[PDB]
């Protein structure tokens, strides 16, 4: 059935909204997330007019539901219409429970302190008889009172009718932009990734307050092994990230500091075996303060360069 | 076919129940579990009335089965109707074997001693001619006499007709709440996760009853490596859990105690090499009792703070 | 088309059988296995009677094939009928190549020496006009002459028409029980899991025939690390098993023996440094024989308690 | 539409062939491989005869394509007919691009030097009016000029019309056998699996040219840890293989040699501490040559027993 | 509906193009990548001619869309037509949003400095009434202004109408070649794979500036363990690659250099214990410069042999 033509040849406005239900999948490796939600559409048409008797109501296929199609989805959405209603004044609104995979990029520049923006794009199948324009119902758009992206904080949930569109579309269409900006609770990462990685480094550094090579070399190289094994343990948390992250920059600094610690221990032993205990003691005493200070500085510059 | 209108314009009650069969999938990482079960529905209608001859019986599509739709499912349920029957007094009951993924959150605040509640939500496609209300058949709802969630204990299986519903639904509907509360057999975890993690720590602590740095540092750092490798081994059991768990809090305490053990061994060696054997002996003898006592205390406070 | 009514109002018997082809998937983590097989059904009906000319034969949908439905399947079976035949005396037999996931529990109480029983359940959609009862064709049921569950031994393949059924079914139905009991070739596990796990333990024990603490502690703790790493290597073989297995009990005994070995080495060093070489020598010499004997005993009790 | 009856009541021959395109999936763990290929069928029928005008040609469903069904497939093939043609003399040949998972067993008796045979089985739905027999078109069967199973060498690609068939089929059918025999390029495995595994063993053996227990025990047990970690690294390459492989036999020999090396180092230290330096020196000097020679011998017997 | 016959019996040209949207999946292990894109087709037909009134426009099935079929796809593409338009002069162009898995080989000869070429192949279902030839619309073909293969650089995106085709096709068809040549940002790999692998090697080499066997052997073998563990950590980045890669050649050189380092340390200790300190000092001093120089040389030859 053709869409109802406008009375005054004015573009038809459709009020669309989403109330998220489950955001269950966040596949960082696949750079996608799977969401279940109730898509609500409102089209004002002069059809199925109601009489002042037995009112309040219809059919799943007999009423023209406009073609609302997502853009950034892997496959076509698995939709299931739940309710279809028509306002007797002529405002047909219907809600469909749909499951959809969303193809959105997650940048981990600032993991685990990241704050990302999931994106959903909407388009319509405009027809020559009547153009279709999209708006957003503020009273309808919202987020679930449920778990709501467990382990994340929903910072904002906004919609913008972006006039921009890809050049392939010969005509111009008002692509609709749902942007959901979410931060991450970073607290658990402090004792699960960051603090032990520093404890191992400090165990490495305590080799300076020692003086025996056979113990310094063990205390440094074994803690290097511990750090590598802990990196193996942590890499299940981290995603693939083919680019220089922030954690991937701290970890490189830590490898570099293990290298410098080994270099120092070797130089101290070489000086002390070459009958120069004075210089060896001097360099060890200097590094006792130098290493933590250099580490603190390097982390400060790293943070300011990434934040 | 339209649902049978009420004789006295009273809401139609439907007796619904589930007898679980297989709960085979418990994908902790995906925060979902897949269940197979027999959904049984009972609608009282004045249709297909039976005669006192050749009674006891029908069709899969010729009889109006009410639209029972789950809420918290990834995709629409993969149903397969098994039996359809009608009581000659007018009570049509039918059972459908359905497979369904369920999107429910599992909180691991208290893993492995957790006790969670799986949730199933039911809604109907109410029509204006006759409203639909849902109840629960106690004689029909039940759990399988089979394996019944292997590795778990089914504490309770209850149903509540919650008047609450999400604000998107313009009308009001009686969403139906199946809550299945299950505890976990925690015994195997005691020798598979907890006890070896303590054995390694005690091997670390036995470095206090020693007096040689070249052996204390080995005995501590190598056991740190052993603990990290054992954490790698155990993390297959644990799920992702982007939040401070209970095991994730014991493990942090253990990393902290390895740090303090290394700090002590270093201080003892530094004192003993700086011609103060008395203070070194005193601190070692004190820590021999201090470390186990502090560990026991810290676990007590950790348990009371998590339980 | 309705099933043919009985001539003498006697229940209709159906001869059913399965000849397995591929058992390709054995997903221990998912507690399921995927099997491909030829399901053969034989129903005796007075339809499509043959004449003594051009005999020996039909249609995929024009002949009533009884509704044979599996019970313990994740999704409905992916069937594909291959042959449909009718015996001129009136015995229609047809074979369908079907792929099916089977939801069966595998208990690893006795891994790797386990001997499990896969289960397939069959039910029919009995109609009021004529009841349906199921039997088994011994001449038709069988297992593939092919690989036949590679790495397993098929002990038995039997069928029982169990009168028992779940209480949800209001009527009584003769659920059909295919039980396939299979043992496991355990030989490869002896050099792949068990023997190296003992070699590492013996390397740990050879620390008793030594007398230097700096070497005993290395030889014990490094072999503890080796054992943990080997456990990591082996856990790909083992499934999740949320319960105390047999291998999971040997491994706990091994962790306990590493703990006791460390305790002994520490006590021996403490005695020998406290000017009591006699008692230290006595305890070391005693443990040289005590440890292997205690291990052998503990394994004997463990086996008798698990077998 | 019924197949064309024979003119002289002779069995109908069908010329079938496959030109492989992609063999993309080789899931060793699942014991299956997924292949894309063009299945070409040629049936000679007296239908759609061509006239000497506008010749050279049809329809996807109006012409009887014989039921060619694979046997060893997980699910039914995902076919897509590409071209359908009929020779004016009466030889209709058509090619369908089909994707199919194949359930074939891969035996790793001789990994990585294995040479396996993938198998595809073909059957037809023979009808009583005219029997169907299958042959092979040599001019049509072939392998892709493309990558062609990357990392493998296609040794042979042959077809045999095996008269044998499973006993379930009441009649006799000529099951068609495509066997594709492929060897493996084993070169990369020499530096990726085999050579480092020997380098670690040689590092272990260099403990004989030493004389200090505190260094011999480290050099042996730490290399045992290195070997276990390298086995963890390599096990991603190896498949599950629930049976004694060839690599799984070298690795057992290597564990045994680590055990014997530890035993020797302990015996040498015990002799040298028990005031018998002569015997300790003798046993060390003997083992310096004994260990490599025994290893070379044992590998020779292992190869002859597996090859 | 038959395709429109040519007016002058000339082959019909179709202008086809692709504007990529998401290249979300790059499954190196599966040797495939999944892409979402808008396929745009332009066929010039003398149908649906427009009048100079209410112009600018149609139907999804009433207009003959030519059969454009990809070649190198796992399954048939999951298409969804978005827009269908006809130019009043007679140039019908339509765009379909399609999701497709692409089976293309990725060679990692030069990982991580690789530069690969993804391939898409197009064919048509040519009919005898009118032949079909394919061209490319430069103004339509393009790549997304979006993320555009995150972690990769799109070097080129070209199309060639290759006259070549596989020999199975009895006729000749103009297979269409989209080749997308993409390089990889290799920077992050320098601190994530390459630099730490060298830091560990340098820590190994600093054993030459030492003189105690009990420390040299620890410093070398423990760093061998660290290198193996780091290889385990890195192998998540690397794909399966059953062939001698470039990283897989550096890693072999590194294992070889660990072997030579152990051999040297053993020889130095053996010389120094055999009352030849002069030769031991000479060989150690020589290797101090020999090892880094040999490593630099070997990397140069390795690069020139792989680049």
Curated annotation (Swiss-Prot), chains A, B, C, D, E:
It comes from the Bacteria. Changing residue 234 to M: Displays an increased sensitivity to propofol but not to desflurane. It is a multi-pass membrane protein. Keywords: Cell inner membrane, Cell membrane, Ion channel, Ion transport, Ligand-gated ion channel, Membrane, Potassium, Potassium channel, Potassium transport, Receptor, Signal, Sodium, Sodium channel, Sodium transport, Transmembrane, Transmembrane helix, Transport. The keyword DNA-binding does not apply. Tetraethylammonium (TEA) and tetrabutylammonium (TBA) inhibit the proton-activated currents in a dose- and voltage-dependent manner in vitro, whereas the blocker of acid sensing ion channels, amiloride, has no effect. Channel current of GLIC can be inhibited by inhaled and intravenous general anesthetics at and below concentrations used clinically. Ion conduction is also inhibited by lidocaine and by divalent transition metal ions such as cadmium ions. GO terms for cellular component: plasma membrane. Residues 209-211, 274-276 are cytoplasmic. It is found in: Cell inner membrane. Its main location: membrane. Residues 1-185, 237-244 are periplasmic. GO terms for molecular function: extracellular ligand-gated monoatomic ion channel activity; identical protein binding; potassium channel activity; sodium channel activity; transmembrane signaling receptor activity. Changing residue 214 to Q/D: Decreases binding affinity of TBA. It holds the Pfam family Neur_chan_LBD. Homopentamer. Cationic channel with similar permeabilities for Na(+) and K(+), that is activated by an increase of the proton concentration on the extracellular side. Displays no permeability for chloride ions. Shows slow kinetics of activation, no desensitization and a single channel conductance of 8 pS. Might contribute to adaptation to external pH change. The homologous nature of GLIC to eukaryotic nicotinic acetylcholine receptors and other eukaryotic pentameric ligand-gated ion channels, and its sensitivity to general anesthetics, define GLIC as a structural and functional model of signal transduction in the nervous system, also relevant for exploring the molecular basis of anesthetic action. Consists of an N-terminal ligand-binding domain that encloses a wide aqueous vestibule and a transmembrane domain that forms a narrow channel. Belongs to the ligand-gated ion channel (TC 1.A.9) family. This is Proton-gated ion channel. It comes from Gloeobacter violaceus (strain ATCC 29082 / PCC 7421). The gene is glvI.
């Amino acid at each position: 059935v053709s869409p109802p033509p406008p009375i005054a040849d004015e573009p038809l406005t459709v009020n669309t909204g989403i109330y998220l239900i489950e955001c269950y999948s966040l596949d960082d490796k696949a750079e996608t997330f799977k969401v279940n939600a109730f898509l609500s559409l409102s089209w004002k048409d002069r059809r199925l007019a109601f009489d002042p008797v037995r009112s309040g109501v219809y059919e799943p296929e007999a009423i023209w539901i406009p073609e609302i199609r997502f853009v950034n989805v892997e496959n076509a959405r698995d939709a299931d219409v739940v309710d279809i209603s028509v306002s007797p004044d002529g405002t047909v609104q219907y809600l469909e429970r749909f499951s959809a995979r969303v193809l959105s990029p997650l940048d981990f520049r600032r993991y685990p302190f990241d704050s990302q923006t999931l994106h959903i794009y909407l388009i319509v199948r405009s027809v020559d008889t009547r153009n279709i324009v999209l708006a957003v119902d503020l009273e309808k758009v919202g987020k679930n009172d449920d778990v709501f992206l467990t382990g994340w904080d929903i910072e904002s949930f906004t919609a913008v009718v972006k006039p921009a569109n890809f050049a392939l579309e010969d005509r111009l269409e008002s692509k609709l932009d749902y942007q959901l900006r979410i931060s991450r609770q970073y607290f658990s990462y402090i004792p699960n990734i960051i603090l032990p990685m520093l404890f191992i480094l400090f165990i490495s550094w305590t080799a300076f307050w020692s003086t025996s090579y056979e113990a310094n070399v063990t205390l440094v190289v074994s803690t290097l092994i511990a750090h590598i094994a802990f990196n193996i343990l942590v890499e299940t948390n981290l995603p693939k990230t083919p680019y220089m992250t922030y954690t991937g920059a701290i970890i490189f600094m830590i490898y570099l500091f293990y290298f410098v610690a080994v270099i120092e221990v070797t130089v101290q032993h070489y000086l002390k075996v070459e009958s120069q205990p004075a210089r060896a003691a001097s360099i060890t005493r200097a590094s006792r303060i130098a290493f933590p200070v250099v580490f603190l500085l390097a982390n400060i510059i790293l943070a300011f360069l990434f934040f």
